[PDB]
Ligand binder design. Structure first.
Ligand SMILES: CCCCCCSC[C@H](NC(=O)CC[C@H]([NH3+])C(=O)O)C(=O)NCC(=O)O
Ligand SMILES: CCCCCCSC[C@H](NC(=O)CC[C@H]([NH3+])C(=O)O)C(=O)NCC(=O)O
Lengths: 209, 209
């Protein structure tokens, strides 16, 4: 620490980490980078992969949203209780990422003409998480194990935005629905989800959700 | 252990882990799933995300290539020496995964009309790795730290398949160039890259590379 997040004025791939930091009683600084400033091309060249978010943890500067989540999961004891849970947690996050990737594609390059096919294919992409929950304490705990982890925050964020994209998409997935309500009920997460910093911040950057 | 890899008859997203197991003097079982078998629709329904590779480490079953690479690094000591290196290795791997995905799209959906543009933009996607190297002991060591990690194996594979797609794509990247020649010189890796199991197996599944 301290923690500094450099990203555009949206939730996107920074919202899950923000949620994680809040739930963990952590404080951080927001360095907002507007699209206009970005289009000037000054900062972009200084970014490892030419993209944001960029994270700062003390003398450590990081890029890649999932590397950041994993770094927090590890430095905050949110990566399972043994090596086996760490692997399962990675397997879950990689899955959350694959779906997030498809989400972004739809939102930014084919919303109007691709939304119907997306929502149609959505159940097939959600079932895997529903299945995982059913095999872990009847879905009464977390995605992996009985302790929250970095994967939970990413999964939760993705589920929350899909409910915005497609209301009722979790109606046929009771475990996922209860899971979302449960983790959302966590006091520090509930406070974050209703905080002005979050609400006043759009999900994406093209005004679509 | 023992290890078992369940994947299609191609190098694709499994060659990195195979190369890692080979370099670490590990033994594994190869269950090749032909396209004919796959199309029987019996295997896919049992895969978490309906996809391969599937990995077996004793009683642990895993999916997602990077999750498997991370698991192997964690249980074999190929994940850096501290939390700082571990995070940078994740940052590197996420970058490798991003480019590998662009590579996959090119190969399977637009090789003919996309190859020109792809090779032209490749330098921009390779430079970050050249930079990471120049900031780590002048690039005479590995991608992160002074010991081989899971990220090196994934980066090495990605670089090697790109040299096939665009020979000499590393001519303007001396560090990556020497890096590839150096890691390929490692005895267990040199034997791996020369083994019939590796040589006989095509890079991808459509005959393109
Ligand atoms: C209201 C404004 C909303 C803006 C939303 C911007 S999303 C920007 C986009 N971000 C990413 O690609 C993040 C990738 C993520 N870190 C990963 O896992 O690879 C980017 O860096 N783009 C860099 C570029 O385009 O040059
Ligand atoms: C000569 C034959 C060559 C075959 C190459 C097959 S690549 C197959 C494809 N594999 C993947 O998508 C792996 C994804 C990887 N695990 C990741 O998520 O990063 C799959 O399982 N697809 C499942 C499906 O399409 O239903």
């Amino acid at each position: 620490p301290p923690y500094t997040i450099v990203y555009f004025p949206v939730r996107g791939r920074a919202e899950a980490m923000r949620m994680l930091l809040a739930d963990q009683g952590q404080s951080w600084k927001e360095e907002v980078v507007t699209i206009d400033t970005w289009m000037q091309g000054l900062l972009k060249p200084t970014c490892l992969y030419g993209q944001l978010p960029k994270f700062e943890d003390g003398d450590l500067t990081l890029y890649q949203s999932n590397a950041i989540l994993r770094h927090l999961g590890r430095s905050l004891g949110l990566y399972g209780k043994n090596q086996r849970e760490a692997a399962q947690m990675d397997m879950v996050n990689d899955g959350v990422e694959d779906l997030r990737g498809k989400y972004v594609t739809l939102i930014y390059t084919n919303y109007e003409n691709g939304k119907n096919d997306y929502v149609k294919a959505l159940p097939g992409h959600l079932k895997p998480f529903e299945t995982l929950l059913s095999q872990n304490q009847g879905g009464k705990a977390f995605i992996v194990g009985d302790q929250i982890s970095f994967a939970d925050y990413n999964l939760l964020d993705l589920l929350l935005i899909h409910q915005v994209l497609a209301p009722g998409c979790l109606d046929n997935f009771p475990l996922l629905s209860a899971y979302v309500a449960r983790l959302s009920a966590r006091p520090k997460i509930k406070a974050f989800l209703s905080s002005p910093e979050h609400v006043n911040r759009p999900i994406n950057g093209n005004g679509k959700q």
